Amino acid sequence: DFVERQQWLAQPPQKEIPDLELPVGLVIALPTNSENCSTQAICVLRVRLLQTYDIESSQKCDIAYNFLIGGDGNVYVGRGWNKMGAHMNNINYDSQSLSFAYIGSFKTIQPSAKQLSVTRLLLERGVKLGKIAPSYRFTASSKLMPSVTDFKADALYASFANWTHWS
Ligand SMILES: *[C@@H]1O[C@H](CO)[C@@H](O)[C@H](O)[C@H]1NC(C)=O
């Protein structure tokens, strides 16, 4: 199940956001670099903070990510399936991918069992809906942009290392 924008009380995007070419062959994991969360109520708060941060501080039109995965094993909708994320700050990457952002800092600490499980369910749901190509790669944002320090999670990316679609 998905906590939708209207369920976590998302601000509207400060401007219109371009649509994404579907289906997408690349799915990109990123750390949110905020505190993590165990329940839906605290996760709701986290997501609202990141939207506010992304708009006020980072100067994006909206929360950067397509989806956010909380430590409670829930999926929080940022821009969603059909809008273009701003995760890589690079039009070439962002126009050909989806971002799954993991609520937390994961240089050392691991994502929870639930964070990993729902990732699988989410990738599956995306293939069924025709948002993700069956031949997709799931990969690390630090691999795509090695000099960007905001993408280094490392303990997050190790958890996916031996998944089949992982690169
Ligand atoms: C969140 O991170 C803390 C470390 O600050 C850890 O002890 C805790 O178990 C984590 N909780 C979840 C659900 O990820």
Side-chain angles (χ1 to χ4, degrees):
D1 210 4
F2 287 62
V3 181
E4 317 274 355
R5 293 172 62 93
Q6 64 260 30
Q7 291 171 335
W8 61 267
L9 274 195
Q11 296 187 295
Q14 300 310 294
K15 283 101 136 90
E16 292 245 28
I17 294 185
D19 280 344
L20 232 196
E21 157 249 67
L22 284 1
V24 122
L26 182 67
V27 178
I28 296 163
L30 297 97
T32 229
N33 289 333
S34 82
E35 190 176 4
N36 62 5
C37 58
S38 310
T39 55
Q40 192 159 300
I42 293 138
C43 285
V44 163
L45 293 177
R46 299 276 111 93
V47 176
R48 282 209 261 166
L49 169 63
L50 292 158
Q51 188 184 39
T52 286
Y53 180 81
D54 290 355
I55 292 178
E56 294 306 321
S57 188
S58 295
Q59 278 138 173
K60 311 277 179 37
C61 292
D62 202 7
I63 192 163
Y65 318 107
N66 295 104
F67 296 101
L68 296 92
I69 310 202
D72 69 334
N74 283 304
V75 180
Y76 297 78
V77 179
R79 298 188 194 199
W81 290 122
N82 307 318
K83 289 309 211 167
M84 207 196 278
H87 41 287
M88 306 296 105
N89 193 211
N90 177 290
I91 295 157
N92 286 164
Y93 275 145
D94 288 333
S95 59
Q96 307 283 264
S97 58
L98 283 168
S99 48
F100 290 5
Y102 292 76
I103 306 178
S105 194
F106 307 98
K107 282 157 77 190
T108 292
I109 85 185
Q110 284 211 72
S112 68
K114 292 235 195 59
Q115 276 190 301
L116 303 178
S117 292
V118 79
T119 294
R120 289 181 170 287
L121 296 187
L122 189 54
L123 291 160
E124 282 164 27
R125 176 68 84 252
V127 175
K128 296 180 216 294
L129 286 187
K131 311 298 191 188
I132 300 163
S135 304
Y136 69 92
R137 302 303 229 277
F138 191 25
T139 185
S141 55
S142 53
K143 180 153 171 223
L144 306 177
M145 304 237 75
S147 318
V148 177
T149 58
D150 265 351
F151 296 151
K152 27 149 242 193
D154 223 66
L156 165 67
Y157 304 138
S159 314
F160 301 121
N162 293 142
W163 285 23
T164 28
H165 291 85
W166 186 257
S167 293

